[PDB]
Amino acid sequence: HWGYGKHNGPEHWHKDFPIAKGERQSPVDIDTHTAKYDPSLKPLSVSYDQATSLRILNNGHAFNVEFDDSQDKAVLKGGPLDGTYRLIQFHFHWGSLDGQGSEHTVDKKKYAAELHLVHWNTKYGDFGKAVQQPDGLAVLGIFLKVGSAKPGLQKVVDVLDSIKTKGKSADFTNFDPRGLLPESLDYWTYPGSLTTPPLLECVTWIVLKEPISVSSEQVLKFRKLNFNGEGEPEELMVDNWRPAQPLKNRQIKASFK
Numbered sequence: 001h002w003g004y005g006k007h008n009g010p011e012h013w014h015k016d017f018p019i020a021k022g023e024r025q026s027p028v029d030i031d032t033h034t035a036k037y038d039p040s041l042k043p044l045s046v047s048y049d050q051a052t053s054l055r056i057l058n059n060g061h062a063f064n065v066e067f068d069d070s071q072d073k074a075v076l077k078g079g080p081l082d083g084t085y086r087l088i089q090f091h092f093h094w095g096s097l098d099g100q101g102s103e104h105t106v107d108k109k110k111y112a113a114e115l116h117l118v119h120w121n122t123k124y125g126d127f128g129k130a131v132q133q134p135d136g137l138a139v140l141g142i143f144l145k146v147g148s149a150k151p152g153l154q155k156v157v158d159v160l161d162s163i164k165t166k167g168k169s170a171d172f173t174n175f176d177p178r179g180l181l182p183e184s185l186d187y188w189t190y191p192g193s194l195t196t197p198p199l200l201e202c203v204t205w206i207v208l209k210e211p212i213s214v215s216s217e218q219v220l221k222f223r224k225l226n227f228n229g230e231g232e233p234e235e236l237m238v239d240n241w242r243p244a245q246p247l248k249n250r251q252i253k254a255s256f257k
Ligand SMILES: O=C(O)Cc1cccc([N+](=O)[O-])c1
Pocket: 116, 118, 139, 193, 194, 195, 196, 197, 198
């Protein structure tokens, strides 16, 4: 099955998921000089005051911080979006070294990591129905750079020892994702896809301009996770990022001058 190795990594995904070579794949390089300011874009509305995290999961590709999405409790709206999108999970992508890890790039710059907050359009009722629609998901992407620690991330880091290997989960209640957000909500937006199989072309991407800072110690604990299951040969969970894909016939719009 798919992964991030030599034999099963991004460059192979198209064999099982031909949409890998589609017209609206993600991530992309954001060319800041050609992304045009769009005055018609709205401020993004991130309403996470009632978010109810439940659990953290090692799915063998990343770890997912999961939310109760059975009511409108943590929603993303505004920005480029029409309607209301409910938070279901967040996860990250990261590198073996601080010089790579992000999926999106900014003028070809790779950040150490990228956080993806995944939301589904309530007009489709559930996640599985939403991913079948071109406006089904809104993913908020946030770059991580290594410097100062992110206090709000530390709860996540400290639980990772308990989900070292694929298929492990742990209770993870009361975690507030507001602690993961940067000061500014300036963003770029474009139409794209999931960045893992099945690579469905269902996402409005909203990539924040301002990275968060995490410490070397924090990212080092991401890199102690394992792709393998308990008791199998250890292969560190690192470089679980898809590289930039062709922009094709897309425009990247900026919310800011
Ligand atoms: O389980 C999976 O890899 C598919 C999936 C599910 C939810 C979000 C995703 N994304 O690319 O942001 C991908």
